[PDB]
């Protein structure tokens, strides 16, 4: 559970926002791309795994699960690529509510930024720093540090 | 010191690699841009501070220290923008050796990747996972978790 992440893809402004969620903490990382492709998803996972100790990624859909490029990046970075079937049905709700919240935040910041990619990183920042108590950025470090020890 | 980062800009292939180093751990994040501008540096710091608790950034040169756009991002993300004068002379040496190591790794992976940006993230990943026995990725989480506790 310190090493499990879920991918999530949402749309705004004609663009795609790819999100990785660290399941145990709710910490996220995200980027904007014109369209979800295996190549863009593979690069995003390579970024994520150089930053945090990614053991398993639950992919966001069956095309990214199938994609040879995504499988190659998961091989390269040492990630176990898994499906993202909500065998726990609470998962669909949690992801959907996170995407709503993120879009609400983006709307709240959107006029401070020339580009959507700025507004999405402002939203990542607000999400990860929000105290709910500890923030998700505190929870993810506590969780991994406890694993390392 | 859990919150202190240093910016560093190095060149390869006609492109610019911007690196942020977490000084106490040697953990890095990096990206490839066509040229170093205040706008690109500001976006990179907004990304970094949504991912880690960035208290202070030592900027890499006086243009990024002066840049109103960089100052606006550091204000937005709650970062103290400082100069990066090597008041400790060991700094110039450590950064130069880091840039050399990174370029060495990039050359070792470069034929595994179509784009330089891929090879640079491969290098970030290898740097941060290298045991030298803890890795930089373990050391940054240990440091920040110790500060949070």
């Amino acid at each position: 559970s310190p090493g499990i992440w879920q991918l999530d893809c949402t749309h705004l402004e004609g663009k795609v926002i790819l999100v990785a969620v660290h399941v145990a903490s709710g910490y996220i990382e995200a980027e904007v791309i014109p369209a979800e492709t295996g190549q863009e998803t593979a690069y995003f996972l390579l970024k994520l795994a150089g930053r945090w100790p990614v053991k398993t990624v639950h992919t966001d859909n069956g095309s990214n699960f199938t994609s040879t490029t995504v499988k190659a990046a998961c091989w390269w970075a040492g990630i176990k690529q898994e499906d993202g079937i909500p065998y726990n049905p609470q998962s669909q709700g949690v992801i959907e509510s996170m995407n709503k919240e993120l879009k609400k935040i983006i709307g709240q910041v959107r006029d401070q930024a020339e580009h959507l990619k700025t507004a999405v990183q402002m939203a990542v920042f607000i999400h990860n720093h929000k105290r709910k108590g500890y923030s998700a950025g505190e929870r993810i470090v506590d969780i991994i540090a406890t694993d390392i020890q | 010191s859990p919150g202190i980062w240093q910016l560093d800009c190095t060149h390869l292939e006609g492109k610019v690699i911007l690196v942020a180093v977490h000084v106490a751990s040697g953990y890095i994040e990096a990206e490839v841009i066509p040229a170093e501008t205040g706008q690109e540096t500001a976006y990179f710091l907004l990304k970094l501070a949504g991912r880690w608790p960035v208290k202070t950034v030592h900027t890499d040169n006086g243009s990024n220290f002066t840049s109103t756009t960089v100052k606006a991002a550091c204000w937005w993300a709650g970062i103290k923008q400082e100069d990066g004068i090597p008041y400790n002379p060991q700094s110039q040496g450590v950064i130069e050796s880091m840039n050399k190591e990174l370029k060495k790794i990039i050359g070792q992976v470069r034929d595994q990747a179509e784009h330089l940006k891929t090879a640079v993230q491969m290098a970030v990943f290898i740097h941060n996972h290298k045991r030298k026995g803890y890795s930089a990725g373990e050391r940054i989480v240990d440091i920040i978790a110790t500060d949070i506790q």
Binding site: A42, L46, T69 | A113, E114
Partner: peptide, 8 residues
Amino acid sequence: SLKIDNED
């Protein structure tokens, strides 16, 4: 293209 970032 047989690269990690583009297996075509």
